[PDB]
Symmetry: C4
């Protein structure tokens, strides 16, 4: 048979829980490493964390808190153009903080982008389920032509070919992830995706050739997953579930069975779209102020970089090595054969 | 040692949960794709769905509802010849809808087929546990000789060699699946089967040479599984469990623990055969009208084809690529690390 | 480094749940296949089943029932020489039924063997934890010299080298299995074993060269596992757990939580040895008369042989092919995504 | 791309639960094998067991009990220099028993070492999270220069390169393990580690070239795991969880749900450090006197060595072979398909 028929099952992919980072010679202290990342000359983050553009994760208060921590918030698009620009302006006016804003790849995308730019947004996230679509390429080209110095984050993709296409269209950051999200059912209902560590590595392999940073978006459930994503080639990670329970996320806290929870739902869930949904609606434990969660995340990254001998994220991306393991490896890696009696601040 | 001794463990097989479809360049919208499939010039389905010929899945009301949705129902064989022909006639008389009917590979198969043909059945399913048996080949040849223009669906098989044999015997559709069914214990009690995605791919590899469509029968538990089966080479899928809970299936709805359920059982279960059974008896949640389940199934397929750049199912079969993953990949692919609070229409 | 250091992790092994048997062209009916097996010219079994020589599995009543079903019982050794010979004689006097008896590889083994031979035992099982020990080889040679026509079953082993050694010592049947038993902790507490399907295949590969049959002993939990063991090269299987709950096993039935159970324990458990044990003590559901369990076991074997085109067990051993699968393959192979409402006679 | 980018995912690693030891020709009895191990000419252990230097595992009473059993206790460092030296002296004065003591790689390490040496400690454990750090190498060199005949145990490492570096710095025992510990979250929160059997094998491969013994530290949950670690190349193992519940460990016994438990926590847990912790706090069942647990551990090792034909641990390290298995292999290896009714002394 011909080539495409015979190649159907050749590829294999890895997720975070399939690997560990191999410790390496180190003369760097975790407290000393640099976790700064340059997404563009006008978009420099002191910590490599972006909060997702989801209506249960990031509005103005979250974006302010993220920026004050050194990261970035993406204001979600499930609001009027006027309100989104208002939230962007609110963040800009809170000390000149960095802020991004999500825009769908639709006919009126440019109208929303116009108002966000008037509000001095620092980056637009052209967000779509399938970034390797001809419409997304076309929209990226159109935005780049109108706003030649605007930071354009485009996604989501999971292949080198898609990454190449968005870069050549004019995106200066590519967002990587099809289906790994904690609330995501795309892989179950449509059958489509790429295991996220392989997606990041494949997309970074291409993006590196152009000097373009990639965002590892989705499926990070512990701080070590972030370290693996950055070591696989991402400049920065995007989190939904691990931020949805913090005080500054939108949505109120509820008590269920005597415990505190916040609603967290996919943007393709029935509730968010108000259909054949590609996400579910759920709840996550309340975690208190964002600063505490960021401290645990960055602390785990600093530890991981110390173990890998990485003074900065460039060294980590370029040098860190992995070792593949089985599910037995994963069970050994977590706590095991002990009844845990207290919740740790970075493990529950 | 000789060749058959040394080859015993060489082969490896994949199931739906071992793979994901890789997203590809796309300029097609899910709502625009064609999901039409031609099983023969006289058996064209607007959607690639067949309801199984099981006594808890398909009688006349189910077959009418399936046909009105653009698919096909197989009237089960656990009834007299007279009653089966009556149900076939009932469907034909409900607007000229397409209908199929199951027939066992037994001495009196031709007598039942005669009455079904008199009733203008559109296709006979020569259904047997092991389609690669000399008796099935012989029966297919005999039916083809008597009814040269009758659509003959023959199965079940799981190998290229068996597919070749049924095609050369005169079947114009081959039904693929040994043991993946949700209610099936063939693999546990007899030890025999082939992981279903590999079975579909191997059988389609052979059937493609002859221009013969294959049905992926069994083991589909989410809409994404159907997309994978079609991308592995099947023209159409056959579902039991995902249809057994709909209003139009036979059998009444029961309340258990305050929830609504319908009985669903293997045709080789003790109850259905009334023995050494190869199926079990169980229950599945009630799902309401068939149309709602079909809408979710076809919607997931449309999404998957959009992600794969497939304007029609021919493109999907011929071009779609997979990536293999571990159980960690599967857990990332489902929702994870969130308490789900609402049932989604396509995920429970 | 040298060769033994570098080869430490090269080998890989398969268990029953790692594979399926591939269906093949068949013109044989399950009810027509032969499941007869010749362990020696004086030890011919109409069904390929031996009940384990364990003190919760086989005494005289079990051995009588097994022989009447066409199989073989091994009278366990946890009794005086006088009592064991008495139980052997009881079986012989119940219609000339076949019977075996277990003997440990100890200084006084020959004394026990002498009384069992006087009682017309048909086969001695020289049973030990580690059959590849110099003492076992020596004892096999000694018994063969004294009793040149006695059927000697020797074990347990899991390698071709050990199989070769026991055959050359004079065993005419080799018993295969280190650690797969349902009640066995050898692999957990000593770290030692070979996944049982690979153990059977490796040992049969060697034994075939000499014309010597092997017994697949341990780890069979469904009838399909027996089919896989025989297809991997074993002439016959030995079962403990699947026989321990039948009426004819020794030990009384107990009610726990309103359900009927029988005690089943490893012969290396604290209770059986009355220490550092290599087995545990447990309970299994009561199953009623042996005949019902044997009917389900042989029925599953007949189905499996029909699927494989095997008119007899020689054809199965010599021709049957496997396909390797993942844990996802295993979950597809069992019933899934259905609430089971009734216990099947061959699946619980 | 360049070499380090392309090698990121090449390596694969094994844990204890990924393998079994293959039985081999044996003429040795478990009760006859030697389990003595020479860590240095002045540090000879009659059994290959060290209790971890953790504040819920080893103080003076544990170290006395370990030494009387033929092993070694490491007095933990979570106490003043004066108190640690006092506990070392207490052990030395209980019959000249061997004792070790943990020291962090800090500026004042030498001051603590000075007091421990004045107290006649037999070995210092230079304990750190990441032994492949330039500071650890430097500290090992400094201690070796001041105390040329002191036994220096240095760790923890997981690579041949790190092992080489610590040996060349002057450590005469290397401690191996990054993240396998039962209470450890390093792999989850920092993303870093090596599956422990591969870590031991890789480190032993290097250490063998220099004649240097390695300690397999962490992740042993059954006695068979210890046998695998020693067969992979370690001279001795270090246990935390399997010793934390014994009478002689520090910390009092608590009743929870009518059962007896002792606290067991990581030394990098919030509680032990009193932060971004790399361990959790939990509890383990109370096990009674240390001697009973040691008897079960050494008994399992003796059984494993008998199965492998190893008269002593040198033979085991140099000759024992493994076979790799799936998770299905693991489930077959444990007890299965039986309800366990009594706790075994070596299996719960
Ligand atoms: N279509 C799959 N996923 C969705 C859905 C949905 O399905 O409805 N809505 C958001 N996403 C993705 O999920 C990430 C969060 O992932 P998380 O950090 O929680 O693991 C987000 O940043 C998105 O990339
Ligand atoms: N012998 C294995 N399976 C049986 C049994 C049984 O065992 O008794 N009765 C039906 N089947 C198969 O199962 C499919 C449904 O599969 P499903 O869509 O529920 O996953 C059906 O279309 C049949 O191919
Ligand atoms: N040392 C490992 N196993 C033991 C133990 C024990 O551990 O104490 N006592 C019996 N055995 C083996 O187990 C088979 C039954 O296996 P089953 O049919 O229940 O899966 C028996 O035929 C024996 O080969
Ligand atoms: N950083 C990972 N682990 C820790 C932690 C912690 O995380 O806080 N504290 C101790 N360790 C290691 O764990 C072994 C015990 O392992 P065990 O015998 O219980 O499996 C010890 O000997 C240490 O090597
Ligand atoms: K761990
Ligand atoms: K997901
Ligand atoms: K099944
Ligand atoms: K076992």
């Amino acid at each position: 048979s011909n080539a495409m028929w015979e190649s159907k099952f050749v590829k294999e992919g890895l997720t975070f829980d399939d690997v560990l980072l191999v410790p390496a010679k180190s003369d760097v202290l975790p407290r000393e490493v640099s976790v700064k990342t340059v997404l563009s000359e006008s978009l420099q983050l002191n910590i490599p964390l972006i909060s997702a553009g989801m209506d249960t994760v990031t509005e103005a208060d979250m974006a302010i808190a993220m920026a004050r921590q050194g990261g970035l918030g993406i204001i979600h698009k499930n609001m009027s153009i006027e309100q989104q620009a208002e939230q962007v302006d609110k963040v800009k006016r809170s000390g000149g903080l960095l802020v991004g804003a999500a825009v769908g790849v639709t006919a009126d995308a440019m109208t929303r982008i116009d108002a966000l730019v008037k509000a001095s947004v620092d980056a637009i996230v052209l967000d779509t389920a399938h970034g390797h679509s001809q419409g997304v390429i076309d929209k990226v080209k159109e935005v780049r032509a109108k706003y030649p110095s605007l930071n354009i984050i485009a996604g989501n993709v999971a292949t080198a070919e898609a990454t190449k296409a968005l870069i050549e269209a004019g995106a200066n950051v590519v967002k990587v992830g099809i289906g790994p999200g904690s609330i995501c059912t795309t892989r179950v209902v449509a059958g489509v995706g790429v295991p996220q560590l392989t997606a990041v590595y494949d997309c970074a392999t291409e993006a590196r050739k152009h000097g373009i940073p990639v965002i590892a978006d989705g499926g990070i459930k512990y701080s070590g997953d972030m370290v693996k994503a950055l070591a696989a080639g991402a400049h920065v990670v995007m989190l939904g579930s691990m931020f949805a329970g913090v005080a500054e996320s939108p949505g109120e806290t509820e008590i269920y069975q005597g415990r505190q929870f916040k609603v967290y739902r996919g943007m393709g869930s029935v509730g968010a779209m108000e259909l054949v949904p590609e996400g579910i609606e759920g709840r996550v434990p309340y975690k208190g102020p964002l600063a505490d969660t960021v401290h645990q995340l960055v602390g785990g990254l600093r530890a991981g970089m110390g173990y890998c001998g990485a003074q900065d994220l460039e060294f980590l991306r370029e040098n860190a090595q992995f070792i593949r393991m089985s599910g037995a490896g994963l069970l050994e890696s977590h706590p095991h054969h002990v009844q845990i009696t207290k919740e740790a601040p970075n493990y529950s």
